[PDB]
Amino acid sequence: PPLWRPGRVLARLREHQPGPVHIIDPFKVPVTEAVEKAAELTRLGFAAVLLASTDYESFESHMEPYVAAVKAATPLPVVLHFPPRPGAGFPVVRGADALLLPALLGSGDDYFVWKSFLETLAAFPGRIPREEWPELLLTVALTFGEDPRTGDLLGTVPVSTASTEEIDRYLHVARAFGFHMVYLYSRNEHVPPEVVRHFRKGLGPDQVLFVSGNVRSGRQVTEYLDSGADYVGFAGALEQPDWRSALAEIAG
Amino acid sequence: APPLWRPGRVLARLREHQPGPVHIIDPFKVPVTEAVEKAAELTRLGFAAVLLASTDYESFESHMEPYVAAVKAATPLPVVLHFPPRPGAGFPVVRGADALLLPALLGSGDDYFVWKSFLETLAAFPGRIPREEWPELLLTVALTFGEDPRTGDLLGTVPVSTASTEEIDRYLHVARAFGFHMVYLYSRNEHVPPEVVRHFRKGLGPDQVLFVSGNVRSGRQVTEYLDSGADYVGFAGALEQPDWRSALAEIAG
Ligand SMILES: CC(C)=CCC/C(C)=C/CC/C(C)=C\CO[C@H](COP(=O)(O)O)C(=O)O
Ligand SMILES: CC(C)=CCC/C(C)=C/CC/C(C)=C\CO[C@H](COP(=O)(O)O)C(=O)O
Ligand SMILES: [Mg+2]
Ligand SMILES: [Mg+2]
Numbered sequence: 001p002p003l004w005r006p007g008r009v010l011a012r013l014r015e016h017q018p019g020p021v022h023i024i025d026p027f028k029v030p031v032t033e034a035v036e037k038a039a040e041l042t043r044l045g046f047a048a049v050l051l052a053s054t055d056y057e058s059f060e061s062h063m064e065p066y067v068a069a070v071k072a073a074t075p076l077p078v079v080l081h082f083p084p085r086p087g088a089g090f091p092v093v094r095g096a097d098a099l100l101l102p103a104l105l106g107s108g109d110d111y112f113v114w115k116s117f118l119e120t121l122a123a124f125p126g127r128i129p130r131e132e133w134p135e136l137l138l139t140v141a142l143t144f145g146e147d148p149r150t151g152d153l154l155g156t157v158p159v160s161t162a163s164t165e166e167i168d169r170y171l172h173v174a175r176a177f178g179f180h181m182v183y184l185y186s187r188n189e190h191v192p193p194e195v196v197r198h199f200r201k202g203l204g205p206d207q208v209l210f211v212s213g214n215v216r217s218g219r220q221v222t223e224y225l226d227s228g229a230d231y232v233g234f235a236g237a238l239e240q241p242d243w244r245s246a247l248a249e250i251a252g
Numbered sequence: 253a254p255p256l257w258r259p260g261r262v263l264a265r266l267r268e269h270q271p272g273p274v275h276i277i278d279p280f281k282v283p284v285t286e287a288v289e290k291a292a293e294l295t296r297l298g299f300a301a302v303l304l305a306s307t308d309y310e311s312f313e314s315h316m317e318p319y320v321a322a323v324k325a326a327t328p329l330p331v332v333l334h335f336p337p338r339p340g341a342g343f344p345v346v347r348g349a350d351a352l353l354l355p356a357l358l359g360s361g362d363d364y365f366v367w368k369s370f371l372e373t374l375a376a377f378p379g380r381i382p383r384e385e386w387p388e389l390l391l392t393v394a395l396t397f398g399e400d401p402r403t404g405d406l407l408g409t410v411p412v413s414t415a416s417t418e419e420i421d422r423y424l425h426v427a428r429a430f431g432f433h434m435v436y437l438y439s440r441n442e443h444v445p446p447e448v449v450r451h452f453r454k455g456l457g458p459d460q461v462l463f464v465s466g467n468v469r470s471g472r473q474v475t476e477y478l479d480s481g482a483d484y485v486g487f488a489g490a491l492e493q494p495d496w497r498s499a500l501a502e503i504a505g
Contacts (some may be wrong), residue, residue, distance in 0.1 A: 004368060004371040004375065110431030113430050115257060117371065118257040118370065118371075121371050121374035121375045122256055122374045124375050169425055173426065176366055177363055178363030178366070
Protein backbone atom coordinates (compact mmCIF):
# COMPACT_ATOMS: atom_id res chain seq x y z
CA PRO A 1 0.00 0.00 0.00
CA PRO A 2 1.66 3.27 -1.05
CA LEU A 3 0.24 5.42 1.80
CA TRP A 4 2.45 8.55 1.84
CA ARG A 5 4.53 7.45 -1.23
CA PRO A 6 3.20 8.29 -4.72
CA GLY A 7 0.56 5.89 -5.91
CA ARG A 8 -2.10 5.29 -8.53
CA VAL A 9 -4.17 8.40 -7.83
CA LEU A 10 -1.24 10.79 -7.92
CA ALA A 11 -0.03 9.13 -11.13
CA ARG A 12 -3.47 9.65 -12.69
CA LEU A 13 -3.53 13.30 -11.65
CA ARG A 14 -0.05 13.88 -13.03
CA GLU A 15 -0.77 12.26 -16.39
CA HIS A 16 -4.29 13.42 -17.07
CA GLN A 17 -4.78 16.62 -19.06
CA PRO A 18 -5.47 19.76 -17.00
CA GLY A 19 -9.10 20.70 -16.49
CA PRO A 20 -11.95 21.41 -14.09
CA VAL A 21 -12.78 19.20 -11.15
CA HIS A 22 -16.15 19.24 -9.45
CA ILE A 23 -16.07 19.06 -5.65
CA ILE A 24 -19.10 17.50 -3.99
CA ASP A 25 -19.62 18.69 -0.37
CA PRO A 26 -21.05 15.42 1.11
CA PHE A 27 -22.46 17.07 4.20
CA LYS A 28 -24.58 19.45 2.11
CA VAL A 29 -25.34 17.41 -1.04
CA PRO A 30 -27.74 14.49 -0.61
CA VAL A 31 -26.21 11.20 -1.64
CA THR A 32 -28.78 10.65 -4.43
CA GLU A 33 -27.76 14.02 -5.93
CA ALA A 34 -24.09 13.15 -5.60
CA VAL A 35 -24.70 9.94 -7.55
CA GLU A 36 -26.49 11.81 -10.31
CA LYS A 37 -23.67 14.30 -10.50
CA ALA A 38 -20.95 11.65 -10.44
CA ALA A 39 -22.39 10.00 -13.54
CA GLU A 40 -22.02 13.27 -15.45
CA LEU A 41 -18.47 14.01 -14.31
CA THR A 42 -17.37 10.82 -15.93
CA ARG A 43 -18.82 11.79 -19.36
CA LEU A 44 -17.12 15.20 -19.20
CA GLY A 45 -13.71 13.60 -18.70
CA PHE A 46 -12.80 15.05 -15.31
CA ALA A 47 -9.78 13.48 -13.65
CA ALA A 48 -11.27 12.70 -10.26
CA VAL A 49 -14.21 13.42 -8.02
CA LEU A 50 -13.35 15.31 -4.80
CA LEU A 51 -15.65 14.98 -1.73
CA ALA A 52 -14.76 17.90 0.53
CA SER A 53 -16.10 20.13 3.23
CA THR A 54 -14.82 22.41 6.00
CA ASP A 55 -17.51 21.03 8.34
CA TYR A 56 -18.33 17.39 9.09
CA GLU A 57 -19.93 15.22 11.80
CA SER A 58 -20.46 11.45 12.18
CA PHE A 59 -17.91 11.16 9.44
CA GLU A 60 -17.49 7.43 9.25
CA SER A 61 -21.11 6.41 9.24
CA HIS A 62 -21.99 9.08 6.71
CA MET A 63 -18.97 8.77 4.41
CA GLU A 64 -18.31 5.07 4.06
CA PRO A 65 -21.63 4.41 2.28
CA TYR A 66 -21.49 7.88 0.57
CA VAL A 67 -18.17 7.00 -0.97
CA ALA A 68 -19.49 3.56 -1.93
CA ALA A 69 -22.51 5.10 -3.68
CA VAL A 70 -20.35 7.51 -5.59
CA LYS A 71 -17.87 4.80 -6.59
CA ALA A 72 -20.71 2.68 -7.92
CA ALA A 73 -21.62 5.64 -10.23
CA THR A 74 -18.17 6.61 -11.54
CA PRO A 75 -14.88 4.85 -12.27
CA LEU A 76 -12.99 8.06 -11.47
CA PRO A 77 -10.88 8.16 -8.32
CA VAL A 78 -12.73 9.48 -5.29
CA VAL A 79 -10.52 11.76 -3.25
CA LEU A 80 -11.44 13.05 0.24
CA HIS A 81 -10.47 16.56 1.45
CA PHE A 82 -11.34 17.62 5.01
CA PRO A 83 -9.55 19.40 7.85
CA PRO A 84 -8.00 17.38 10.66
CA ARG A 85 -9.05 17.61 14.36
CA PRO A 86 -6.68 17.31 17.33
CA GLY A 87 -7.11 13.91 18.94
CA ALA A 88 -8.11 12.28 15.71
CA GLY A 89 -6.06 13.60 12.84
CA PHE A 90 -7.67 13.55 9.38
CA PRO A 91 -10.92 11.66 8.90
CA VAL A 92 -10.81 8.54 6.75
CA VAL A 93 -13.09 5.76 5.50
CA ARG A 94 -12.48 2.55 3.72
CA GLY A 95 -13.16 2.77 0.00
CA ALA A 96 -11.83 6.22 -0.69
CA ASP A 97 -9.11 6.13 -3.36
CA ALA A 98 -7.10 8.90 -1.75
CA LEU A 99 -7.08 11.47 1.02
CA LEU A 100 -5.73 14.92 0.16
CA LEU A 101 -3.69 15.92 3.27
CA PRO A 102 -3.38 19.69 3.55
CA ALA A 103 -0.29 21.03 5.36
CA LEU A 104 -1.55 24.59 6.08
CA LEU A 105 1.76 26.36 5.88
CA GLY A 106 0.18 29.74 6.50
CA SER A 107 -1.35 28.68 9.79
CA GLY A 108 -0.29 30.08 13.11
CA ASP A 109 -1.06 26.70 14.76
CA ASP A 110 1.59 24.04 14.20
CA TYR A 111 -0.99 21.27 14.41
CA PHE A 112 -2.56 22.55 11.20
CA VAL A 113 0.83 23.38 9.59
CA TRP A 114 1.75 19.66 9.84
CA LYS A 115 1.40 17.88 13.15
CA SER A 116 -1.95 16.63 12.06
CA PHE A 117 0.03 14.45 9.63
CA LEU A 118 1.89 12.92 12.58
CA GLU A 119 -1.32 12.20 14.49
CA THR A 120 -2.91 10.67 11.35
CA LEU A 121 -0.02 8.37 10.63
CA ALA A 122 0.38 7.39 14.26
CA ALA A 123 -3.25 6.24 14.20
CA PHE A 124 -2.78 4.37 10.91
CA PRO A 125 -3.92 1.73 10.11
CA GLY A 126 -6.58 1.79 12.82
CA ARG A 127 -9.92 0.21 11.90
CA ILE A 128 -9.13 -0.11 8.17
CA PRO A 129 -7.00 -2.94 6.78
CA ARG A 130 -3.59 -1.72 5.59
CA GLU A 131 -4.13 -3.02 2.08
CA GLU A 132 -7.49 -1.15 1.87
CA TRP A 133 -6.36 2.30 2.95
CA PRO A 134 -6.59 5.26 0.64
CA GLU A 135 -3.37 6.72 -0.76
CA LEU A 136 -2.24 10.03 0.74
CA LEU A 137 -1.64 13.07 -1.45
CA LEU A 138 0.73 15.28 0.58
CA THR A 139 -0.33 18.83 -0.22
CA VAL A 140 0.75 22.37 0.59
CA ALA A 141 -2.55 24.19 1.30
CA LEU A 142 -2.71 27.97 1.18
CA THR A 143 -5.54 30.44 1.72
CA PHE A 144 -6.13 33.78 0.02
CA GLY A 145 -8.24 36.72 0.99
CA GLU A 146 -10.12 37.63 4.13
CA ASP A 147 -11.45 34.39 5.64
CA PRO A 148 -12.27 34.40 9.33
CA ARG A 149 -14.07 31.08 9.09
CA THR A 150 -10.92 29.18 8.11
CA GLY A 151 -8.81 31.47 10.30
CA ASP A 152 -10.88 30.71 13.42
CA LEU A 153 -10.97 26.96 12.72
CA LEU A 154 -7.51 26.22 11.41
CA GLY A 155 -5.46 29.27 12.33
CA THR A 156 -4.77 30.34 8.74
CA VAL A 157 -3.63 33.90 7.86
CA PRO A 158 -4.26 35.01 4.25
CA VAL A 159 -1.12 34.70 2.12
CA SER A 160 0.39 38.09 1.40
CA THR A 161 0.43 38.96 -2.27
CA ALA A 162 2.08 42.41 -1.69
CA SER A 163 5.40 40.77 -2.65
CA THR A 164 6.63 37.27 -3.43
CA GLU A 165 8.50 36.87 -0.09
CA GLU A 166 5.95 34.67 1.60
CA ILE A 167 5.00 32.59 -1.37
CA ASP A 168 8.65 31.98 -2.24
CA ARG A 169 9.20 30.48 1.23
CA TYR A 170 6.25 28.21 0.62
CA LEU A 171 7.67 27.18 -2.80
CA HIS A 172 11.03 26.34 -1.20
CA VAL A 173 9.24 24.10 1.27
CA ALA A 174 7.01 22.53 -1.36
CA ARG A 175 10.06 21.60 -3.37
CA ALA A 176 12.50 20.57 -0.61
CA PHE A 177 9.86 18.60 1.28
CA GLY A 178 8.71 16.85 -1.87
CA PHE A 179 5.10 17.68 -1.59
CA HIS A 180 2.89 16.02 -4.14
CA MET A 181 0.50 18.90 -4.72
CA VAL A 182 -0.25 22.52 -3.91
CA TYR A 183 -3.84 23.66 -3.31
CA LEU A 184 -4.48 27.42 -3.58
CA TYR A 185 -7.94 28.30 -2.16
CA SER A 186 -9.98 31.47 -1.52
CA ARG A 187 -13.18 31.13 0.46
CA ASN A 188 -14.39 34.67 -0.18
CA GLU A 189 -12.36 36.14 -3.01
CA HIS A 190 -10.44 34.74 -5.94
CA VAL A 191 -6.92 33.33 -5.95
CA PRO A 192 -5.00 35.75 -8.22
CA PRO A 193 -4.15 34.22 -11.62
CA GLU A 194 -0.69 35.77 -11.34
CA VAL A 195 -0.12 33.79 -8.06
CA VAL A 196 -1.15 30.60 -9.86
CA ARG A 197 1.42 31.44 -12.58
CA HIS A 198 4.09 32.12 -9.97
CA PHE A 199 3.43 28.76 -8.39
CA ARG A 200 3.43 26.88 -11.68
CA LYS A 201 6.78 28.38 -12.54
CA GLY A 202 8.29 27.62 -9.16
CA LEU A 203 7.03 24.07 -8.74
CA GLY A 204 8.63 20.90 -10.06
CA PRO A 205 7.02 19.32 -13.14
CA ASP A 206 5.49 16.45 -11.22
CA GLN A 207 3.93 18.68 -8.50
CA VAL A 208 0.21 19.09 -9.16
CA LEU A 209 -1.37 22.51 -8.80
CA PHE A 210 -5.03 22.88 -7.76
CA VAL A 211 -6.85 26.21 -7.45
CA SER A 212 -10.41 26.62 -6.06
CA GLY A 213 -12.81 29.09 -4.58
CA ASN A 214 -15.66 30.97 -6.22
CA VAL A 215 -15.10 29.47 -9.65
CA ARG A 216 -18.48 29.71 -11.37
CA SER A 217 -17.83 30.16 -15.05
CA GLY A 218 -15.95 28.45 -17.85
CA ARG A 219 -14.08 31.75 -18.43
CA GLN A 220 -12.58 31.49 -14.96
CA VAL A 221 -11.59 27.85 -15.45
CA THR A 222 -9.84 28.80 -18.74
CA GLU A 223 -8.05 31.73 -17.21
CA TYR A 224 -6.71 29.55 -14.36
CA LEU A 225 -5.64 26.74 -16.71
CA ASP A 226 -3.91 29.32 -18.94
CA SER A 227 -2.18 30.55 -15.77
CA GLY A 228 -0.73 27.10 -15.05
CA ALA A 229 -3.28 25.33 -12.89
CA ASP A 230 -3.47 21.59 -13.38
CA TYR A 231 -6.97 21.37 -11.85
CA VAL A 232 -9.60 24.02 -11.15
CA GLY A 233 -12.02 23.05 -8.43
CA PHE A 234 -15.60 24.12 -8.01
CA ALA A 235 -18.28 23.14 -5.51
CA GLY A 236 -20.82 25.85 -4.92
CA ALA A 237 -21.67 26.53 -8.54
CA LEU A 238 -23.51 23.19 -8.64
CA GLU A 239 -25.32 23.47 -5.28
CA GLN A 240 -28.55 24.58 -6.91
CA PRO A 241 -31.39 23.01 -8.90
CA ASP A 242 -30.15 24.04 -12.36
CA TRP A 243 -26.74 22.44 -11.78
CA ARG A 244 -26.75 20.59 -15.09
CA SER A 245 -26.72 23.89 -17.02
CA ALA A 246 -24.07 25.34 -14.78
CA LEU A 247 -21.89 22.24 -15.12
CA ALA A 248 -22.14 22.38 -18.92
CA GLU A 249 -21.05 26.03 -18.98
CA ILE A 250 -18.16 25.57 -16.56
CA ALA A 251 -16.91 22.49 -18.40
CA GLY A 252 -17.66 23.95 -21.86
CA ALA B 253 -2.15 7.54 25.20
CA PRO B 254 1.64 8.04 24.99
CA PRO B 255 2.62 11.72 24.32
CA LEU B 256 4.58 10.50 21.28
CA TRP B 257 5.00 13.60 19.10
CA ARG B 258 3.53 15.97 21.71
CA PRO B 259 5.81 17.48 24.36
CA GLY B 260 6.42 15.09 27.26
CA ARG B 261 8.63 14.59 30.31
CA VAL B 262 11.91 14.49 28.45
CA LEU B 263 11.34 17.71 26.53
CA ALA B 264 10.19 19.43 29.73
CA ARG B 265 13.42 18.38 31.43
CA LEU B 266 15.51 19.59 28.54
CA ARG B 267 13.69 22.93 28.53
CA GLU B 268 14.04 23.51 32.26
CA HIS B 269 17.46 22.07 33.07
CA GLN B 270 20.52 24.29 33.38
CA PRO B 271 22.38 24.49 30.04
CA GLY B 272 25.55 22.46 29.86
CA PRO B 273 27.52 19.67 28.21
CA VAL B 274 25.85 16.39 27.24
CA HIS B 275 27.95 13.27 26.66
CA ILE B 276 26.91 11.13 23.73
CA ILE B 277 27.70 7.42 23.96
CA ASP B 278 27.98 5.57 20.62
CA PRO B 279 26.50 2.19 21.58
CA PHE B 280 27.78 0.34 18.63
CA LYS B 281 31.37 1.30 19.45
CA VAL B 282 31.44 1.64 23.26
CA PRO B 283 31.24 -1.61 25.27
CA VAL B 284 28.20 -1.64 27.56
CA THR B 285 30.32 -2.04 30.69
CA GLU B 286 32.14 1.18 29.77
CA ALA B 287 28.82 2.92 28.98
CA VAL B 288 27.58 1.96 32.46
CA GLU B 289 30.75 3.37 34.10
CA LYS B 290 30.37 6.55 32.08
CA ALA B 291 26.64 6.88 32.88
CA ALA B 292 27.42 6.89 36.60
CA GLU B 293 29.81 9.81 36.13
CA LEU B 294 27.36 11.75 34.01
CA THR B 295 24.81 11.48 36.78
CA ARG B 296 27.29 12.90 39.29
CA LEU B 297 27.91 15.85 36.97
CA GLY B 298 24.19 16.55 36.73
CA PHE B 299 23.95 16.42 32.98
CA ALA B 300 20.45 16.79 31.54
CA ALA B 301 20.31 13.45 29.71
CA VAL B 302 22.38 10.64 28.29
CA LEU B 303 22.28 10.43 24.48
CA LEU B 304 23.01 7.14 22.72
CA ALA B 305 23.80 7.99 19.08
CA SER B 306 25.64 6.76 16.03
CA THR B 307 25.59 7.24 12.28
CA ASP B 308 26.07 3.45 11.86
CA TYR B 309 24.06 0.60 13.33
CA GLU B 310 23.15 -3.03 12.74
CA SER B 311 20.91 -5.50 14.57
CA PHE B 312 19.50 -2.49 16.34
CA GLU B 313 16.81 -4.07 18.35
CA SER B 314 18.69 -7.04 19.77
CA HIS B 315 21.69 -4.91 20.53
CA MET B 316 19.91 -1.89 21.97
CA GLU B 317 17.24 -3.36 24.16
CA PRO B 318 19.70 -4.77 26.69
CA TYR B 319 22.13 -1.81 26.19
CA VAL B 320 19.47 0.69 27.01
CA ALA B 321 18.37 -1.39 30.02
CA ALA B 322 21.96 -1.47 31.36
CA VAL B 323 22.34 2.27 31.00
CA LYS B 324 18.97 2.96 32.60
CA ALA B 325 19.90 0.81 35.61
CA ALA B 326 23.00 3.00 36.02
CA THR B 327 21.50 6.47 35.83
CA PRO B 328 18.20 8.23 36.49
CA LEU B 329 18.90 10.68 33.61
CA PRO B 330 16.61 10.24 30.57
CA VAL B 331 18.14 8.07 27.87
CA VAL B 332 17.58 9.57 24.42
CA LEU B 333 18.28 7.74 21.19
CA HIS B 334 19.58 9.56 18.07
CA PHE B 335 20.13 7.58 14.82
CA PRO B 336 19.40 8.17 11.13
CA PRO B 337 16.30 6.57 9.56
CA ARG B 338 16.33 3.98 6.75
CA PRO B 339 13.66 3.84 4.01
CA GLY B 340 11.36 0.88 4.59
CA ALA B 341 11.79 1.14 8.31
CA GLY B 342 11.94 4.75 9.41
CA PHE B 343 13.79 5.53 12.65
CA PRO B 344 15.03 2.70 14.82
CA VAL B 345 13.40 2.21 18.21
CA VAL B 346 13.58 -0.05 21.26
CA ARG B 347 11.47 -0.22 24.35
CA GLY B 348 13.06 1.25 27.41
CA ALA B 349 14.33 4.43 25.77
CA ASP B 350 12.87 7.59 27.30
CA ALA B 351 12.86 9.47 23.98
CA LEU B 352 13.95 9.25 20.37
CA LEU B 353 15.44 12.45 18.90
CA LEU B 354 13.85 12.65 15.33
CA PRO B 355 16.07 14.71 13.00
CA ALA B 356 14.37 16.51 10.08
CA LEU B 357 17.40 17.13 7.82
CA LEU B 358 16.16 20.33 6.23
CA GLY B 359 19.31 20.72 4.14
CA SER B 360 19.06 17.30 2.51
CA GLY B 361 18.40 16.94 -1.19
CA ASP B 362 16.35 13.80 -0.41
CA ASP B 363 12.85 14.46 0.86
CA TYR B 364 12.84 11.19 2.79
CA PHE B 365 15.55 12.62 5.04
CA VAL B 366 14.08 16.11 5.09
CA TRP B 367 10.93 14.67 6.73
CA LYS B 368 9.21 11.68 5.17
CA SER B 369 11.12 9.42 7.53
CA PHE B 370 8.80 10.91 10.18
CA LEU B 371 5.74 9.73 8.24
CA GLU B 372 7.17 6.22 7.85
CA THR B 373 8.08 6.07 11.54
CA LEU B 374 4.69 7.15 12.73
CA ALA B 375 2.85 4.95 10.24
CA ALA B 376 4.73 2.00 11.76
CA PHE B 377 3.87 3.02 15.30
CA PRO B 378 3.13 1.21 17.57
CA GLY B 379 4.51 -1.91 15.90
CA ARG B 380 6.29 -4.44 18.15
CA ILE B 381 6.18 -2.17 21.29
CA PRO B 382 3.14 -1.49 23.56
CA ARG B 383 1.74 2.05 23.02
CA GLU B 384 2.11 2.91 26.71
CA GLU B 385 5.79 1.82 26.61
CA TRP B 386 6.83 3.85 23.55
CA PRO B 387 9.47 6.55 23.95
CA GLU B 388 8.59 10.22 23.57
CA LEU B 389 9.59 11.88 20.26
CA LEU B 390 11.66 15.03 20.15
CA LEU B 391 10.91 16.74 16.78
CA THR B 392 14.19 18.31 15.75
CA VAL B 393 15.53 20.42 12.90
CA ALA B 394 18.99 18.87 12.11
CA LEU B 395 21.57 20.84 10.17
CA THR B 396 25.08 19.97 9.10
CA PHE B 397 28.11 22.20 8.82
CA GLY B 398 31.40 21.91 7.03
CA GLU B 399 32.58 19.44 4.40
CA ASP B 400 31.02 16.05 5.24
CA PRO B 401 30.72 13.54 2.44
CA ARG B 402 29.89 10.71 4.84
CA THR B 403 26.59 12.35 5.88
CA GLY B 404 26.11 13.67 2.40
CA ASP B 405 26.41 10.26 0.78
CA LEU B 406 24.24 8.62 3.43
CA LEU B 407 21.51 11.22 4.03
CA GLY B 408 21.74 13.66 1.14
CA THR B 409 22.85 16.58 3.24
CA VAL B 410 24.61 19.66 1.80
CA PRO B 411 26.61 21.81 4.25
CA VAL B 412 24.70 24.88 5.38
CA SER B 413 26.09 28.01 3.65
CA THR B 414 27.04 30.75 6.07
CA ALA B 415 28.15 33.28 3.42
CA SER B 416 24.82 35.00 4.12
CA THR B 417 22.01 34.21 6.59
CA GLU B 418 19.52 33.43 3.83
CA GLU B 419 19.63 29.67 4.22
CA ILE B 420 19.53 29.60 8.03
CA ASP B 421 16.76 32.22 8.08
CA ARG B 422 14.67 29.87 5.97
CA TYR B 423 15.34 27.05 8.45
CA LEU B 424 14.43 29.31 11.35
CA HIS B 425 11.08 30.19 9.73
CA VAL B 426 10.37 26.45 9.41
CA ALA B 427 11.55 25.70 12.92
CA ARG B 428 9.21 28.29 14.36
CA ALA B 429 6.16 27.80 12.12
CA PHE B 430 6.28 24.02 12.28
CA GLY B 431 6.76 24.11 16.05
CA PHE B 432 9.86 22.00 16.18
CA HIS B 433 10.95 21.10 19.69
CA MET B 434 14.70 21.39 19.13
CA VAL B 435 17.36 22.35 16.64
CA TYR B 436 20.57 20.26 16.42
CA LEU B 437 23.58 21.95 14.76
CA TYR B 438 26.27 19.38 13.92
CA SER B 439 29.68 19.36 12.21
CA ARG B 440 31.25 15.95 11.52
CA ASN B 441 34.65 17.33 10.49
CA GLU B 442 34.74 20.98 11.52
CA HIS B 443 33.19 23.17 14.17
CA VAL B 444 29.73 24.74 13.98
CA PRO B 445 30.44 28.48 14.05
CA PRO B 446 29.62 30.16 17.39
CA GLU B 447 28.04 33.06 15.44
CA VAL B 448 25.58 30.60 13.80
CA VAL B 449 24.68 29.32 17.29
CA ARG B 450 24.00 32.94 18.31
CA HIS B 451 21.85 33.51 15.20
CA PHE B 452 19.80 30.48 15.99
CA ARG B 453 19.35 31.34 19.68
CA LYS B 454 18.16 34.85 18.80
CA GLY B 455 15.84 33.54 16.11
CA LEU B 456 14.21 30.63 17.96
CA GLY B 457 11.33 30.73 20.43
CA PRO B 458 12.24 30.53 24.15
CA ASP B 459 11.04 26.94 24.53
CA GLN B 460 12.96 25.61 21.51
CA VAL B 461 16.03 23.70 22.64
CA LEU B 462 19.32 24.31 20.87
CA PHE B 463 21.96 21.54 20.70
CA VAL B 464 25.38 21.93 19.05
CA SER B 465 27.87 19.04 18.58
CA GLY B 466 30.86 17.90 16.62
CA ASN B 467 34.50 17.96 17.59
CA VAL B 468 33.96 19.42 21.04
CA ARG B 469 37.03 18.32 23.00
CA SER B 470 37.63 21.08 25.52
CA GLY B 471 35.89 22.98 28.27
CA ARG B 472 36.75 26.24 26.48
CA GLN B 473 34.66 25.13 23.50
CA VAL B 474 31.69 24.16 25.69
CA THR B 475 31.84 27.56 27.41
CA GLU B 476 31.99 29.42 24.09
CA TYR B 477 28.94 27.56 22.76
CA LEU B 478 26.96 28.02 25.97
CA ASP B 479 27.87 31.73 25.95
CA SER B 480 26.62 31.86 22.36
CA GLY B 481 23.22 30.51 23.38
CA ALA B 482 23.41 26.73 22.99
CA ASP B 483 21.29 24.95 25.58
CA TYR B 484 23.37 21.73 25.27
CA VAL B 485 26.79 20.98 23.84
CA GLY B 486 27.23 17.38 22.79
CA PHE B 487 30.46 15.42 22.69
CA ALA B 488 31.12 11.77 21.93
CA GLY B 489 34.61 11.27 20.55
CA ALA B 490 36.53 13.04 23.28
CA LEU B 491 35.63 10.15 25.64
CA GLU B 492 36.31 7.29 23.23
CA GLN B 493 39.75 6.64 24.66
CA PRO B 494 41.29 5.04 27.80
CA ASP B 495 41.84 8.30 29.66
CA TRP B 496 38.21 9.35 29.28
CA ARG B 497 37.84 10.26 32.94
CA SER B 498 40.44 13.09 32.56
CA ALA B 499 38.93 14.22 29.30
CA LEU B 500 35.44 14.38 30.90
CA ALA B 501 36.75 16.37 33.82
CA GLU B 502 38.34 18.91 31.49
CA ILE B 503 35.22 19.28 29.30
CA ALA B 504 32.82 19.49 32.27
CA GLY B 505 35.00 21.38 34.77
C1 LIG C 1 -8.00 25.55 3.74
C2 LIG C 1 -7.55 24.36 2.87
C3 LIG C 1 -7.12 24.57 1.45
C4 LIG C 1 -7.51 23.10 3.33
C5 LIG C 1 -7.88 22.64 4.72
C6 LIG C 1 -8.99 21.54 4.65
C7 LIG C 1 -10.36 22.02 4.20
C8 LIG C 1 -10.99 23.22 4.92
C9 LIG C 1 -10.93 21.31 3.18
C10 LIG C 1 -12.30 21.62 2.60
C11 LIG C 1 -12.29 21.94 1.08
C12 LIG C 1 -11.94 23.43 0.94
C13 LIG C 1 -10.50 23.90 0.94
C14 LIG C 1 -12.83 24.43 0.76
C15 LIG C 1 -14.33 24.25 0.67
O1 LIG C 1 -14.83 24.55 -0.82
C16 LIG C 1 -13.96 24.67 -1.87
C17 LIG C 1 -14.83 24.93 -3.13
O2 LIG C 1 -15.17 26.33 -3.02
P1 LIG C 1 -16.44 26.80 -3.95
O3 LIG C 1 -17.74 26.34 -3.25
O4 LIG C 1 -16.33 28.31 -3.84
O5 LIG C 1 -16.30 26.29 -5.39
C18 LIG C 1 -13.14 23.40 -2.16
O6 LIG C 1 -13.55 22.26 -1.82
O7 LIG C 1 -12.04 23.58 -2.70
C1 LIG D 1 23.23 14.71 10.75
C2 LIG D 1 22.30 14.76 11.98
C3 LIG D 1 22.50 15.93 12.90
C4 LIG D 1 21.37 13.86 12.26
C5 LIG D 1 20.99 12.63 11.49
C6 LIG D 1 21.07 11.37 12.37
C7 LIG D 1 22.50 10.98 12.80
C8 LIG D 1 23.56 10.86 11.71
C9 LIG D 1 22.71 10.74 14.11
C10 LIG D 1 24.05 10.30 14.72
C11 LIG D 1 24.48 11.35 15.77
C12 LIG D 1 25.25 12.45 15.06
C13 LIG D 1 24.48 13.58 14.51
C14 LIG D 1 26.56 12.55 14.90
C15 LIG D 1 27.53 11.52 15.43
O1 LIG D 1 28.45 12.20 16.51
C16 LIG D 1 28.16 13.42 17.11
C17 LIG D 1 29.23 13.82 18.16
O2 LIG D 1 30.40 14.10 17.44
P1 LIG D 1 31.88 14.08 18.22
O3 LIG D 1 32.45 12.64 18.25
O4 LIG D 1 32.69 14.92 17.26
O5 LIG D 1 31.72 14.65 19.58
C18 LIG D 1 26.81 13.45 17.86
O6 LIG D 1 26.31 12.37 18.25
O7 LIG D 1 26.25 14.57 18.01
MG1 LIG E 1 -19.42 22.02 4.12
MG1 LIG F 1 0.77 4.11 12.95
